[PDB]
Structures are given as structure tokens and as C-alpha cells.
Design an enzyme around this catalytic site. Structure first.
Site, PDB file in Angstrom:
ATOM      1  N   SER A  35      10.054  -2.635  -0.588  1.00 32.56           N
ATOM      2  CA  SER A  35       8.638  -2.895  -0.843  1.00 32.56           C
ATOM      3  C   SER A  35       8.229  -2.640  -2.280  1.00 32.56           C
ATOM      4  O   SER A  35       7.104  -2.994  -2.645  1.00 32.56           O
ATOM      5  CB  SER A  35       7.758  -2.037   0.070  1.00 32.56           C
ATOM      6  N   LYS A  38       6.696  -5.505  -4.190  1.00 36.77           N
ATOM      7  CA  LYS A  38       5.275  -5.848  -4.183  1.00 36.77           C
ATOM      8  C   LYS A  38       4.609  -5.606  -5.534  1.00 36.77           C
ATOM      9  O   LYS A  38       3.564  -6.201  -5.815  1.00 36.77           O
ATOM     10  CB  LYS A  38       4.550  -5.063  -3.083  1.00 36.77           C
ATOM     11  N   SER A  95       1.112  -1.089   1.972  1.00 35.90           N
ATOM     12  CA  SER A  95       2.370  -1.842   1.956  1.00 35.90           C
ATOM     13  C   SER A  95       2.441  -2.833   3.121  1.00 35.90           C
ATOM     14  O   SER A  95       3.439  -2.919   3.839  1.00 35.90           O
ATOM     15  CB  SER A  95       3.580  -0.907   1.960  1.00 35.90           C
ATOM     16  N   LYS A 199       3.741   3.036  -6.221  1.00 42.16           N
ATOM     17  CA  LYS A 199       4.145   2.284  -5.034  1.00 42.16           C
ATOM     18  C   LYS A 199       5.304   2.913  -4.269  1.00 42.16           C
ATOM     19  O   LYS A 199       6.324   3.285  -4.859  1.00 42.16           O
ATOM     20  CB  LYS A 199       4.527   0.851  -5.437  1.00 42.16           C
TER      21      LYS A 199
HETATM   22  C1  LIG Z   1       8.633  -1.736   2.148  1.00 40.45           C
HETATM   23  O1  LIG Z   1       9.602  -1.079   1.896  1.00 40.45           O
HETATM   24  C2  LIG Z   1       8.105  -1.859   3.603  1.00 40.45           C
HETATM   25  N1  LIG Z   1       9.145  -1.374   4.511  1.00 40.45           N
HETATM   26  C3  LIG Z   1       9.208  -1.825   5.886  1.00 40.45           C
HETATM   27  O2  LIG Z   1       8.405  -2.590   6.331  1.00 40.45           O
HETATM   28  C4  LIG Z   1      10.318  -1.234   6.744  1.00 40.45           C
HETATM   29  C5  LIG Z   1      10.685  -2.161   7.893  1.00 40.45           C
HETATM   30  C6  LIG Z   1      10.454  -1.748   9.197  1.00 40.45           C
HETATM   31  C7  LIG Z   1      10.797  -2.583  10.244  1.00 40.45           C
HETATM   32  C8  LIG Z   1      11.370  -3.819   9.981  1.00 40.45           C
HETATM   33  C9  LIG Z   1      11.607  -4.230   8.675  1.00 40.45           C
HETATM   34  C10 LIG Z   1      11.264  -3.393   7.623  1.00 40.45           C
HETATM   35  C11 LIG Z   1       6.830  -1.084   3.725  1.00 40.45           C
HETATM   36  N2  LIG Z   1       6.903   0.030   2.575  1.00 40.45           N
HETATM   37  C12 LIG Z   1       7.188   1.292   3.261  1.00 40.45           C
HETATM   38  C13 LIG Z   1       6.658   2.342   2.478  1.00 40.45           C
HETATM   39  O3  LIG Z   1       5.703   2.089   1.686  1.00 40.45           O
HETATM   40  O4  LIG Z   1       7.134   3.512   2.562  1.00 40.45           O
HETATM   41  C14 LIG Z   1       6.440   1.159   4.758  1.00 40.45           C
HETATM   42  C15 LIG Z   1       7.180   2.067   5.734  1.00 40.45           C
HETATM   43  C16 LIG Z   1       4.995   1.648   4.652  1.00 40.45           C
HETATM   44  S1  LIG Z   1       6.515  -0.243   5.168  1.00 40.45           S
END
Ligand SMILES: *C(=O)[C@@H](NC(=O)Cc1ccccc1)[C@@H]1N[C@@H](C(=O)O)C(C)(C)S1
Length: 247
Positions: A35, A38, A95, A199
Site C-alpha cells: 500500500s 498509494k 488505505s 503512509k
Molecule cells: C496495503 O498494504 C493494504 N494492505 C491490504 O489490503 C492487505 C490485504 C488483505 C487481504 C487481502 C489482500 C491484501 C492496506 N494497507 C495496510 C496498512 O495500511 O497497514 C491495511 C491493513 C490497512 S490495508
């Protein structure tokens, strides 16, 4: 450099005003970034508004995520249609994976990865960086990867080109245009003096990651933490890097 015992596999902290490393560990190692991608999508959204190509108030429909497990704006609101401003806030604050993909589709359609990577080169990032999606989610089994040095160049160029990004990442809660209140994933807001970005990221393969930034008395630093062991250890590591940063 200081002897730090970090959880992270790769980590560094840099002074903005000269790009100098104040601590570095595996700073050239190619790592999945998830992420943290982003930040590039945010860069290109702001570039588009400035280029008169995108309206903050334009309404978009959230795209459906291939994986129903990824964090998403639709899941916690059950609302399909959002302004570009709100999608951009949700992308940076909670996120929201669907928000990022929605912005990338509006910007360049199926050609958004090319524009992400073109911008990477234009920002000075090395050939070791490859983006695959606006959210950082895997695409056809390919992963977004970068190095800590490259992520610093991206982060520093984002903040210097579009300092208003910090007006969003500094807030522990953002109240969207629509009304929904989104909570920041940045647990260090209000904890480290002067910290106002940037981030988080997490996947099983990327571990727990964080890009942080803080400013005190004119001096701004950027910390990068990749593949820490838990959701809180990436912030413990960041606390260590920020004390080194302002020594
Ligand atoms: C970015 O890394 C995002 N990660 C995910 O969505 C994990 C995921 C879970 C299930 C299936 C596919 C992927 C978001 N960024 C993190 C973060 O900011 O720590 C989140 C956990 C908030 S989600």
C-alpha cells in the site's frame, strides 16, 4: 551510524534538505511495498488536479476488488459513489484499496501502471522500483517493489511538489465530504512531536511497513520501515529512526 535493533528487514531515515542518510539498513534491497504504492497514486491525483485534468468534486463509483479480504471503503460504509476528494482521503487515511484503484482507473484506465512507473523515473527512482497497481495489490501475480532509497526519493518529491498532501496525512481522522469519518492508520500522530505523515502498508509478504515524516525547526526527515514483525513494531522502529533523525 547509530546501532539500532529494528524489527524491520530494511529501514532508513534521511534528511530532506540534502538527501543524506542518517541511518540505513538494507537500503538498496528490493522489497515488496504493497500500500505504500498509494503515495504514487496520490502524487498523480494531485498532478492531474493541477494540470486541470481532474476535479476534486467529480463523483466516481468504487470499483469492486478482486479479493474481498482487502481493506475497502465500500465495506465499512456500503456507499458506492464518492467524490475524488473523498477517495483520495480514504486512500491516504485508511488505505482503502478500492478508492485507490478507482482513482487510477479514472486517471489512465488500464494504462495507469505505465504512468506510475513513468512518474517514478521522472522522480529519480531507480529501475529497481516497479509499480503494478494504484493500490499496490498484486496484479496477475506481480508485486509492487522498491527500495528504501527509492521510497525516500518518491516521498521527498511528493512532499516538495505537493506539500498539501500533509494537510491530509497529518490528521488522525478525516471527515469526508459525504460525512463518513475515516480513522488514520498512522498510530504515531500525536505521539512523535512534529510527525505529520506519511503512509502505512501491510501484506504477509511485505510485512508491516511505514513511511513517516516529521519536521522540527525547519529540519524535516523521512523514515522508511519495511517488513517489521507486527503492526506496532513498525512504529517502534519509526520512533527509533526519528530520534536518530533529529539527533
Ligand atoms: C496495503 O498494504 C493494504 N494492505 C491490504 O489490503 C492487505 C490485504 C488483505 C487481504 C487481502 C489482500 C491484501 C492496506 N494497507 C495496510 C496498512 O495500511 O497497514 C491495511 C491493513 C490497512 S490495508
Amino acid at each position: 551510524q547509530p546501532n539500532l535493533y529494528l524489527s524491520a528487514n530494511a529501514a532508513a531515515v534521511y534528511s530532506v534538505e540534502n538527501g543524506e542518510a542518517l541511518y540505513e539498513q538494507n537500503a538498496d534491497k528490493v522489497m515488496p511495498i504493497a500500500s505504500l504504492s498509494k503515495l504514487m497514486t496520490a502524487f498523480l491525483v494531485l498532478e492531474a488536479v493541477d494540470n486541470n485534468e481532474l476535479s476534486w468534486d467529480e463523483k466516481l463509483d468504487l470499483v469492486r476488488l478482486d479479493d474481498p479480504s482487502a481493506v475497502s471503503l465500500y465495506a465499512i460504509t456500503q456507499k458506492r459513489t464518492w467524490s475524488v476528494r473523498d477517495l483520495y482521503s480514504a486512500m491516504l487515511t485508511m488505505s482503502a484499496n478500492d478508492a485507490a484503484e478507482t482513482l487510477g482507473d479514472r486517471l489512465d484506465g488500464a494504462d495507469f501502471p505505465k504512468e506510475m512507473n513513468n512518474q517514478a523515473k521522472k522522480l529519480g527512482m531507480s529501475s529497481k522500483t516497479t509499480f503494478v497497481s494504484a493500490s499496490g495489490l498484486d496484479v496477475d501475480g506481480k508485486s509492487a517493489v522498491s527500495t528504501t532509497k527509492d521510497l525516500f526519493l518518491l516521498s521527498s518529491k511528493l512532499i516538495s511538489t505537493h506539500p498539501e498532501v500533509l494537510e491530509t496525512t497529518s490528521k488522525p481522522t478525516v471527515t469526508t465530504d459525504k460525512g463518513a469519518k475515516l480513522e488514520s492508520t498512522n498510530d504515531l500522530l500525536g505521539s512523535i512531536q512534529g510527525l505529520d505523515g506519511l503512509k502505512t502498508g501491510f501484506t504477509d509478504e511485505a510485512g508491516y511497513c511505514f513511511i513517516g515524516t516529521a519536521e522540527r525547526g525547519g529540519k524535516r526527515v523521512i523514515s522508511i520501515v519495511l517488513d517489521a514483525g507486527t503492526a506496532e513494531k513498525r512504529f517502534k522502529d519509526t520512533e527509533k529512526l526519528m530520534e536518530v533523525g533529529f539527533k
